Write a protein that binds this ligand. Structure first.
Ligand SMILES: CCCCCCCCCCCCCCCCCCCC
Ligand SMILES: CCCCCCCCCCCCCCCCCCCC
Ligand SMILES: CCCCCCCCCCCCCCCCCCCC
Lengths: 164, 164, 164, 164, 164, 164
């Protein structure tokens, strides 16, 4: 039998589908950077999309570990265009903050039910949001000092294009 | 400039979005096998899902090589349930034949427009479909001989669970 | 001076003694499997007994780290017999669920006394119980597909006998 | 089926349960030493408990080798307190000598039934008991020699804490 | 945009400054032991001072991770003398227990504001405080068993002097 | 007994505390650079801070080597804000020139009192000050040629972030 409540399973399953969309969004940011000829920024976004998928699969495996089942839902069309490099990264940061708030909501739901297993499972994602939000803020800080200077954009494109 | 016609770019972009869906369908087949307790069949479907993503990124990179750009569309909800192992693998076979025919249509359109560059590019996918259809047929053939014998199904699950 | 409360030290010492009993119970399940001639299942139970000893010793060392003291209590006679392989596994799963709930009680006790050190110490056991329950559920699922057919029971005996 | 008499099977089964207690007693001596702050003596006692477990398991496997089966019984609450280090080690010697006589009684019983297999199996424990008794006597001798000087007790605690 | 509240940034910045004082305190204890000619105890205190700096720098980096900044405050003059070795270590134990309570206060504040990121970040410091308090008690227990015998003080001096 | 005069013990002890403040000042400059988003300059300051600590500890050990005693004094609150990158490095240079003059004052004092050991011991610090003043002067020269230009400042930031 399933040892998560149906309310926590649905929250976990909802977050899994949220992570699939996040991975899709970053791929669509990659389509934008490649359309604009920034292969380094695009590469960074392709790697970010891959990383979101591994988040989704950790939700996947935890649900089955607790006797639940995953049901995949429709994935909405992401935006495909942004008003330049900095605009895209601002949309990225606002998106990560939304992901953080949705993780917090599952954590508060689980602790209200005394589902300590799920509370503990979610700590990893809380810690990762701190790092992912920070990565985007640091990039935005550089774009704000760059003030559109192409000599600095180029070096930043090549640097992010080196992401492993 | 873009050197593919818009018709051929649309056909290639539509196909990229079909590979994304295919990936999502195989993941959904994995949600079914894990719910049924066949983790080796599930593992096989998770690897299949990754493989279709690499097909999508191949379309992606060629589209930008030809001066086009990619637009991600919404991903329809895949089915999540089948009436057993054979049913799921038969749904996979039927899907691969649909993907194959989709590829054929692009090839016939590109060749109608004398887009020899895209005709040549598609050869890789024609050959890949031969292998992918064959792999499902092989599993269907083994499942047919197993005929519900759990002794055979167990070893089959563990063997498919070793896919790289 | 002891800086855990007497109620939290008592809860921890009680849990330590529970883990000793858990180890004894699994050893007694081993006496059952060995009597029934399943040396692989018995081997699994012996390894499970050793895992519980390490749990107890972790409670042991945290109690002294916190300035407390451990007092070993009498250990009661575990059952010696089960109505079959699954009956034994079902008993193990029920016991593991009981162990999880008693871990939850110390954590809820520690959290009300604002004993954050003990709340944090217990997170490893919450995460460990998720895996322990999952292993037994997976084994129960395979015996459930095995349906008492000895050719696959033999394979599961060999598989579980390889546990390190 | 069983080729030991039930009288030697129960004698062997009693000794197995005796050895489980022996291990519990040494862990309780560890709880005492850790309470007194002698982690090296406590470490030695934890290792001594481990070794008694292997003795129990050697009886365990021989019982099944001869076609019998093991039944675990309740384990008595060991003492938790002693009036000093020598007093705890004096009780250890007290007990190892009781364990030796406990083995002698099985050997004399097996020899009366002409159960030569069980007589010969017991030779190992006779030789092992000689070593374990001397182990403690040498430790007690150094304690007498220490004459309560913490300068030498600290080195003995450090020495015994090095037990592999 | 700072994503810690101002009361949590202040709590964290205050704790950073407390850690700065703590290392300074341990250095001043080192000045005492060096004046008394116990270079091993002084060496231990020098290592403890360096470890508190690493604790300060982890608050430092987390504050900037969350979008805040650090403000260094004046550091009070620590005591320069103690009534003996164990008097100094007793002050150290009382100080570490004070540091632990100040970490507890930040955690309760963060969880009241539902700042799950800071609550999770603080778990490392909760666990580390358990080991820092335990380390001092073990030393006090040894100084209490030494009872001023210099034959035992000399070996504790050189023992603590090999701290890495 | 002490074989430096009290007038050189205090001059040396004052300089030890002076070096502690220097280390704190450089940390404060790191808080400013990190607040401004220049992680390379911040890294340089963090390394400069720990370099000042090794200066302090060399005074520490020489004071005890001459039969003296160290007394830690209060630490003044360092400034936290500067008008810009170059102003911070200009403040660093003016501070280093002040530290050099304070070493000069100790050296002239020791010389008048014919304390040849301290005169010779201070030679290392004189030569080291030439180096520290020179590194800051070189950085100021590049910042002056940069003339506030972010493309060149970013390169200086990356270079100084590579400091070992
Ligand atoms: C090279 C980077 C490509 C990233 C593509 C991200 C696309 C996200 C939307 C589609 C996701 C559906 C399929 C997911 C399958 C995941 C399988 C993981 C197995 C471990
Ligand atoms: C050897 C494999 C089987 C082991 C079965 C153990 C069953 C539990 C016995 C009761 C507990 C006795 C005390 C054991 C203490 C061990 C402490 C080890 C510390 C290093
Ligand atoms: C060899 C022993 C060194 C002991 C140092 C004790 C320092 C006490 C606190 C003084 C102020 C410290 C300010 C500098 C912080 C340096 C941070 C280094 C890592 C970035």
């Amino acid at each position: 039998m399933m040892v998560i409540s149906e309310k926590v399973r649905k929250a976990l399953n909802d977050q899994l589908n949220r992570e699939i969309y996040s991975s899709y969004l970053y791929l669509s940011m990659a389509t934008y950077f490649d359309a604009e000829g920034f292969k380094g920024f695009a590469h960074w976004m392709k790697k970010q999309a891959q990383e979101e998928l591994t988040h989704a699969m950790k939700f996947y495996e935890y649900i089955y570990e607790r006797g639940g089942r995953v049901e995949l839902e429709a994935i909405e069309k992401p935006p495909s265009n942004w008003n330049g490099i900095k605009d895209a990264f601002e949309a990225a940061l606002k998106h990560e903050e939304f992901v953080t708030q949705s993780i917090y909501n599952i954590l508060e739901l689980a602790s209200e039910e005394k589902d300590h297993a799920t509370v503990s499972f979610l700590k990893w994602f809380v810690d990762e949001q701190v790092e992912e939000e920070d990565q985007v803020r640091e990039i935005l800080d550089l774009l704000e000092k760059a003030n559109g200077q192409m000599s600095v954009i180029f070096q930043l494109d090549r640097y992010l294009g080196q992401r492993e």
